[PDB]
């Protein structure tokens, strides 16, 4: 069928439910300190 591009980030592109998981999975791998 038709495929339409959508951004995965709620930042720049619309779907807001992704951001909660995105920030958590980016903090689950944030190996930086100080």
């Amino acid at each position: 069928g038709t495929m339409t591009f959508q951004f995965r980030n709620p930042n720049f592109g619309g779907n807001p439910n992704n951001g909660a998981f995105l920030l958590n999975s980016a903090q689950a791998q944030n190996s930086y300190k100080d």
Binding site: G1, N9, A26, Y32
Partner: protein, 206 residues
Amino acid sequence: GKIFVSVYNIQDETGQFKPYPASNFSTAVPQSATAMLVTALKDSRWFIPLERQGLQNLLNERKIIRAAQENGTVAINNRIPLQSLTAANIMVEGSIIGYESNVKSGGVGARYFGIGADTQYQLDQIAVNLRVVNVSTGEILSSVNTSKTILSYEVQAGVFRFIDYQRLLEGEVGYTSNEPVMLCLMSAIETGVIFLINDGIDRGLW
């Protein structure tokens, strides 16, 4: 000599419409065969199409011509000699016999630490039946079913990792490509016309 061919209607007998978010009344296939087919027959150097789809407009215009110059007063340069409606020896019936959405979908998406990328593809399938009919007898001289796949793919990539202690770099690159169903329907109709031509050649006709 080129063969006169009369295409009346290539109906969209698929019965399919588009799924959400599309409108409920938005058909999956253009209702505009008999124009892709007339163009395929004209662009193949074998046929001369006759109108037959818009024949009532042609008959009303011929009524207007006939009533404009029946009194013999029209300027003899801009009078239109109506000869007679040219007739076809064969007639191409047909339909869009089927549209299948996602006969083969698929996708692979990987994502290491932060950086990720996915691909997706869907194959629709559109089938067109074309029948060369013998207008003298009504017998169906030939009938072909041509199928064409409609590829729609999508590639995305993205970064969501941290660059510094409290510095987050997000990024996204996306691309999508839906093969036009009108282009694939035109391709199926052109292949069906090639098949009808080669068949009429390969047995007696043409």
